[PDB]
């Protein structure tokens, strides 16, 4: 979508968890892109086509106080 690239990630059981790892070891961002390449190389090449926007969805916290219903 025009305000959400890679939208198929947004709720996934791995996307709930792999970002928590990178938020403690950003040195393993390469090692997570490589890990996606061992099980979904089709997702990997799609993330690679959007990498600057993937980092925005990747670097945020997996939960936030806005999850109660909205931003205000």
Give the helix/strand class. mainly alpha
Question: What's the overall geometry?
Answer: globular
User: Element order, helices and strands?
Assistant: HHHH
Q: What's the CATH architecture name?
A: Orthogonal Bundle
| CATH fold-level topology | Arc Repressor Mutant, subunit A
Give a quick account of the main beta sheet: strands, pairing sense, barrel closure: none
Helix content: 40-55%
The CATH class: Mainly Alpha
What is the domain total for the residues? 1
Q: How many H/I helices?
A: 4
Rg over C-alpha atoms, rounded to the nearest angstrom: 13 Å
CATH-defined superfamily: XPC-binding domain
Give the terminus-to-terminus CA distance.
23 Å
Q: Strand tally, please?
A: 0
* Residue fraction in strands: under 5%
PDB class: dna binding protein
Keywords: hHR23B, XPC binding domain, NMR solution structure, Nucleotide excision repair, chaps, DNA binding protein
Assembly: monomeric
Entry title: Solution structure of XPC binding domain of hHR23B
């Amino acid at each position: 979508g025009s305000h959400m690239p890679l939208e198929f990630l947004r709720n996934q059981p791995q996307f709930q968890q792999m970002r928590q790892i990178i938020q403690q070891n950003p040195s393993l961002l390469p090692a997570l892109l490589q890990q996606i390449g061992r099980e979904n190389p089709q997702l990997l090449q799609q993330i690679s086509q959007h990498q600057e926007h993937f980092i925005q969805m990747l670097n945020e916290p997996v939960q936030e106080a806005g999850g109660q219903g909205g931003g205000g």
